[PDB]
Amino acid sequence: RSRTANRSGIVIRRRVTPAGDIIVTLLTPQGKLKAIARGSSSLNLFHHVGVQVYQGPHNDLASVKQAVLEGALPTLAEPERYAFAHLMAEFADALFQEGEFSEQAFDLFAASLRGVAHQPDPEWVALVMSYKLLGLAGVIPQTARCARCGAPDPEHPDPLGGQLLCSKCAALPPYPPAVLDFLRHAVRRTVRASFEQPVPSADRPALWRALEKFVTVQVGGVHSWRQLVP
Ligand SMILES: [Zn+2]
């Protein structure tokens, strides 16, 4: 809401044009920012960056006037970490359509990139953080009640909505207790507590499947993200 503006954030999308200029999307504490750098920092993917940005009535894209690298995670150069970082970025972009993206969502996102970069189990960090991001977006699964009939404490898969069905609405067998436990409490408890309670990787494919379904149903700017899910 001004001509010129200083913003700090993380590059979550980056495309160089044949013309030689960099079109970037950033997540900042004040929300998503779409910007262009015509042609210090090269605004590299997943870099935490400080920019001065001009936008007037004759340019719909804000124009990057100066850009300084404030922080980077060089460890996202590892294909597997990079894979999950790219998943978090695309997830954040699709969830949250902007301004709608608080200071707390920014901090959560950044923390997710830090977990992905630094921890033994990046796929576990991806999952925890995706359910925690769902919460701050106000796209919360109702796991205390059955998706169809409303019966408390549903324990079964939900093939259509990605939520939870009770035994009497469900065709499929119950989830294992640890999947169930996580599906119930992932959104509400701390990042750290969920980090110290990892779900076994044999049970994980089912968490991704519920997550896909739920997002495909509740949020519409997807397909890019779907393609990066394990
Ligand atoms: Zn039911």
Span from the CA of 199 to the centroid of ligand 1 (angstroms): 26
Count of domains forming the chain: 3
| Residues, CB-to-ion distance under 5 Å, ligand 1 | 146, 148-149, 151, 166, 169
124 with 182, same domain: the answer is yes
108 with 29, same domain: the answer is no
46 with 124, same domain: the answer is no
180 with 115, same domain: the answer is yes
Question: In units of Å, what resolution does this entry have?
Answer: 2.4
Q: Where are the alpha helices (DSSP H) in 119-203?
A: 122-136, 177-185, 191-196
Span from the CA of 174 to the centroid of ligand 1 (angstroms): 13
Supply angle C-alpha 8, 11, 15, rounded to 5. Answer: 135
CA 23 vs CA 14, 194, 213: distances in Å: 6, 36, 31
Span from the CA of 172 to the centroid of ligand 1 (angstroms): 13
Experimental method: X-ray
Residue 145: is it exposed, middle or buried by C-beta count within 10 angstroms (0-12/13-18/19+)?
A: middle
112 with 220, same domain: the answer is yes
Please give the Cα distance from 224 to 142 (Å, whole number): 26
63 with 91, same domain: the answer is no
Q: Is the CB of residue 33 less than 8 Å from the CB of residue 7?
A: yes
133 with 217, same domain: the answer is yes
Token pair belonging to 105: 């969502």
- The parent domain of residue 148 ranges over 140-174
Cβ atoms within 10 Å of 123's Cβ, excluding its own:
19
Indicate the DSSP class of residue 10: E
CATH code assigned at 154: 6.20.220.20
84 with 43, same domain: the answer is no
Decide: helix, strand or coil at residue 191: helix
CATH code assigned at 23: 2.40.50.140
Binding site per annotation, positions for Zn(2+)? 146, 149, 166, 169
CATH code assigned at 180: 1.20.1440.120
Query: Of 226, 208, 216, which Cα lies nearest the Cα of 123?
Result: 208
22 with 108, same domain: the answer is no
Last residue of a domain, one of 77, 92, 120: 77
Span from the CA of 201 to the centroid of ligand 1 (angstroms): 28
147 with 34, same domain: the answer is no
Q: Please give the span between the terminal C-alpha atoms of the chain, in angstroms, as a whole number.
A: 39
Cα radius of gyration (the chain): 19
100 with 202, same domain: the answer is yes
14 with 59, same domain: the answer is yes
Please give the Cα distance from 198 to 69 (Å, whole number): 34
Residue 22 bridge partners (DSSP): 16, 37
Please give the Cα distance from 103 to 107 (Å, whole number): 6
Please give the Cα distance from 23 to 36 (Å, whole number): 5
Span from the CA of 153 to the centroid of ligand 1 (angstroms): 10
